[PDB]
From a paper:
The S protein of HKU1-B forms a trimeric structure, with each protomer featuring a furin cleavage site “RRKRR”, akin to SARS-CoV-2.
To unravel the mechanism underlying the interaction between the S protein of HKU1-B and the host cell receptor TMPRSS2, we elucidated the cryo-EM structures of the HKU1-B S protein incubated with TMPRSS2 in various conformations, including a closed conformation, two 1up conformations (designated as 1up-1 and 1up-2), two 2up conformations (with or without TMPRSS2 bound, referred to as 2up-TMR and 2up-1), and a 3up conformation with TMPRSS2 bound (referred to as 3up-TMR). In the 3up-TMR conformation, all three RBDs are fully in “up” position, each bound with a TMPRSS2 molecule. Compared to the 2up-TMR conformation, the 3up-TMR rotates clockwise by 8°, with its RBDs leaning more towards the central axis. The three TMPRSS2 molecules form interfaces maintained by cation–π and π–π interactions. To improve the local resolution of the interface region, we employed local refinement for the 3up-TMR conformation, achieving a local resolution of 3.6 Å, allowing reliable interface modeling and analysis. The RL2 loop of the RBD firmly clasps the SP domain of TMPRSS2 like a clamp, near the active pocket of SP domain, creating an interface of 850 Å2.
Numbering used by the authors:
A (entry chain D): 148 to 492
B (entry chain A): 349 to 596
Amino acid sequence: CVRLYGPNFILQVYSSQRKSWHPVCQDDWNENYGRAACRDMGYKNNFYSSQGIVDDSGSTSFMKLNTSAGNVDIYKKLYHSDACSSKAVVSLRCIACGVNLNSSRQSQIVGGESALPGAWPWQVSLHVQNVHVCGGSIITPEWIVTAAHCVEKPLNNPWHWTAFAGILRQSFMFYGAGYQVEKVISHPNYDSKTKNNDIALMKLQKPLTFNDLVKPVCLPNPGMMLQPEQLCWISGWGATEEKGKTSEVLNAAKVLLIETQRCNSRYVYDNLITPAMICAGFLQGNVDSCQGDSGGPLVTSKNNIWWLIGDTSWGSGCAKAYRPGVYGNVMVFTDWIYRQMRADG
Amino acid sequence: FSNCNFNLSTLLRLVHVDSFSCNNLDKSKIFGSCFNSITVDKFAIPNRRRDDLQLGSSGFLQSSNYKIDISSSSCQLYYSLPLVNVTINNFNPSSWNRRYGFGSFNVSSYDVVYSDHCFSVNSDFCPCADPSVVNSCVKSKPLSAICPAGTKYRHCDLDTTLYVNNWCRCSCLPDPISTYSPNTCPQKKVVVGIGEHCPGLGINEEKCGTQLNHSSCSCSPDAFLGWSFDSCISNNRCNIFSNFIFNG
Ligand SMILES: *[C@@H]1O[C@H](CO)[C@@H](O)[C@H](O)[C@H]1NC(C)=O
Ligand SMILES: *[C@@H]1O[C@H](CO)[C@@H](O)[C@H](O)[C@H]1NC(C)=O
């Protein structure tokens, strides 16, 4: 039981006696423990970095190494200690997620300029029979997230799920111009009444490249402490007004976070919004930005680095009075994916 | 008061003055000159909001009741009055609240009803819902009646939930003081100007109507919101503000 945390990526460690997650001090850690630690949370042939950092997480029962014993596992050699012997703790990056080219005026949800290429380097587009339908966001070269109600019945088998990345326009994704299918996991509790758990992972067989237009988005950490009116940046080719078809180019302007008690009150949405559903938009008149993509994500920028918080979901009439969009809640189950990404290899 | 003669000493000793400031003027420049008219505007003072009236301030009374102009050669007077025979008139100055059944306030014998917010509507306003639409609503269904002639209806939708198809959603929720979508309720909040009245108390849009007899669209006395009061009586004497304007 091991997990990332917060902005500076401290490994928390669960112990059965202390019943609690705990950090590890950097007393003689190695890439032969560290680069072999990303396969613990579903990263087989990738690694980025590890360093020592200052303790600020908030536990007073650390984890230490049993290097005095011989050749045992990592998971046996972890006892408790009250002090870090070098006062450096786990810092980690399991993949080259994060940065884009910090550009200026990408605002093409209605009334703006187009999404500049390479500045949203995780934006994909998913296709069946070469029509543009749903979006998503990459976290590994082999895994890809999207909204589950695209992969619902009777289209629930993987061989008709063709991903197509890269090109802002509706045309240039051709056959061969985009890697293709593999495994369709789902959170297996989607419903008709609630759309609780409208998030399904997808997998590819052929690992793509981090070249220019493609880069994995950062999946959030357990307990990363958002702000209750935070800015959020969505993207997608969606139709800016309803009863349309699709916008031609990539549109990537901004929205805001509404809290629960405004959405979930009596006038907006009469007590519907679950813990695995996050509201977003602006609770206002016709100022909202629709661009309906059903997976066209919600990307915030805390710790000066882009992080993923919500993938899209259902809504009401396109960007109008009282009716915001309601988003899937992808900090709730960032470990369910990490126990459904552990055993593909 | 125009085309007459006056002075100050018989005035300010015949009314029980407590202060007489001035602005854009010197207090002895009254005693000589010859103006063109004088425009005295008086009203009573609610006690706990007396400090609204500082010359060129924010607050309630200078913003949504009577904006004291800070440009002309005005001179402000704060006087008193014995409460033997004093009957504060408390009447509402707006047309479109007495058109929709504003009768009166219930305050005491000596309480003055000031204002907090002052919302302005158009001429075709009608604060009741549409009754020939509302019957097929089930959820959040409001009261309604028939509007008078030309007054366009309130915009009410029967838009679709996740399962329920005819659930009511109109504008102006919950109350126009704290609406969620301010760019869509017809009652627009405006600040009062120099020499204007407060153009209307706000109507809560969901106490205006009934169910069976959709008559001419009226409202209900609890629904007018945005006013409070206090008592004018201090030192056994109902205090009173009064402005002067020495134009020309
Ligand atoms: C109050 O009214 C009575 C009769 O209406 C009058 O005789 C009396 O003079 C008034 N009070 C004062 C102080 O003038
Ligand atoms: C104000 O008047 C109404 C009607 O006369 C009455 O119902 C209400 O009780 C009065 N207010 C108080 C505080 O008694």
